[PDB]
Amino acid sequence: CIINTTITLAIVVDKLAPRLSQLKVLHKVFSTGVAETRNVVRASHLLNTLYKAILEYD
Amino acid sequence: DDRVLVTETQVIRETLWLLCLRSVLEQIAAY
Amino acid sequence: MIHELLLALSGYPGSIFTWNKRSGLQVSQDFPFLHPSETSVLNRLCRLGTDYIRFTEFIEQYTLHGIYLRAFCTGLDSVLQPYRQALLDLEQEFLGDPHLSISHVNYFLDQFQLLFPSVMVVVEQIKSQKIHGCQILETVYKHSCGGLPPV
Amino acid sequence: MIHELLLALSGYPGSIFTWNKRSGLQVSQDFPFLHPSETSVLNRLCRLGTDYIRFTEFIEQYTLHGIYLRAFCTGLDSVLQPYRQALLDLEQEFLGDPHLSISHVNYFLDQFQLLFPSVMVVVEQIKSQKIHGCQILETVYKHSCGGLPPV
């Protein structure tokens, strides 16, 4: 729709509200999947963070 | 101090690729 | 100035429309280009902008905790959707004919001007009494039996 | 430049996309016609081309000997078939509308970008440890129990 209606800054942002919201969650869910050495603690602590982070959003 | 003086629509295209001007861009940068 | 205003009513304040942390949106002072009689209707128009800003600031802040507070804000954006959509339209009408004045722009808000005020104290009762838990499903219900059809 | 790139991702390097025997495919330097911010995504895009070239060079070289090495390369082209077929398509979409940018082209690869990397070290273990004989049917199997569904 840019190459082919007027479009400016304040419109594309508000159009992307339900995405820039969903994206902020991943910055906190993934932050606990990156801050950590054995292969069994990096995978257990990750998979357990999700099941904890979902019960927060219920 | 010199500046590039970009047009307006060019910014949105650039923002899509990333996906007061120094202020508004600073927020999208955080994304 | 039209597209300048339609951003001020969106949540972005500027030089013409200064922002104050206590009072709210308001016009700075007299402007030579415009008439000195409009300095009033805008102030009457900003009484609406202050509501949306104080709304979205609270919506983002999420503030108190509990799912019933999360969902209230989640729903609070839904009722606030026709406000935004009706604001995007104003630009389209002004893009067509360049003979429309602030009078027509003020006229277009009509319904939002008599809705926000009644849906402003519902938020104020929450942040001023620490309404925690399912008790929200009554504090909002006790105000649901209001006379105003729109509310 | 589009059809220029779609050849660089096929195994043919040129002036815009120089070839280095050690590093791999990469953009030469800044170009005035294009933006200076794209010089990155292409370099992110070439990390895929380097894989296909180093693949097909090894596939042709057949290098070590043994039928189980011949058949491995014989099969290695089969998994690499959807990569080529999905590349022929990109030209057709660009032939229709001339408003598509590199962003969409980068987006189309999607699956190939997360597959080649995991199927790159399987080759490296062979050429670096002289895996001769039927022992390949385990070295490939020990990596077949990976989590990535595509792999």
Q: Kindly determine whether residue A6 and residue C95, on different chains, have CB atoms separated by under 8 Å.
A: yes
CA distance A9 to chain B (A): 7
Let me know: does C16 contact C28? Beta carbons within 8 Å: yes
CA distance A47 to chain B (A): 25
Chains D, C in contact, 3 or more Cβ pairs below 8 Å: no
Residues across chain D: 151
Residue A2, C-beta contacts closer than 8 angstroms, at least 6 positions apart: B9, B12, B13
User: How far apart are alpha carbons C90 and A51 in whole angstroms?
Assistant: 45
User: How far apart are alpha carbons C132 and C129 in whole angstroms?
Assistant: 9
User: How far apart are alpha carbons D73 and C60 in whole angstroms?
Assistant: 56
Q: Kindly determine whether residue A12 and residue B24, on different chains, have CB atoms separated by under 8 Å.
A: no
Interchain contact B13–D (C-beta under 8 A): yes
Residue D3, C-beta contacts closer than 8 angstroms, at least 6 positions apart: D91, D94
Checking D136-140 for CB contacts under 8 A at 24+ apart, the result is: D136/D68, D136/D69, D136/D72, D137/D68, D140/D72
The enclosing H or E element of C123 equals helix C121-127
- 34-93 of C, contacting A, C-beta below 8 A: 67, 70, 84, 88, 91
Tell me chain B's radius of gyration from C-alpha atoms: 10
Interchain contact A22–C (C-beta under 8 A): no
Residue with tokens 């589009």: D2
Which residue in the set A6, A11, A58 is minimally distant from C67, CB to CB?
A: A58
Residue A30, C-beta contacts closer than 8 angstroms, at least 6 positions apart: none
What resolution in angstrom units was achieved for this structure?
8.5
User: How far from D66 is each of D42, D69, D72, D121, CA to CA, in Å?
Assistant: 38, 5, 10, 20
Residues across chain A: 58
Q: Kindly determine whether residue C91 and residue A58, on different chains, have CB atoms separated by under 8 Å.
A: no
User: How far apart are alpha carbons D136 and D114 in whole angstroms?
Assistant: 24
The experimental technique used to determine this model is cryo-EM
Torsion of CA B21, B23, B27, C2, to 10 degrees: -60
User: How far apart are alpha carbons C117 and C138 in whole angstroms?
Assistant: 20
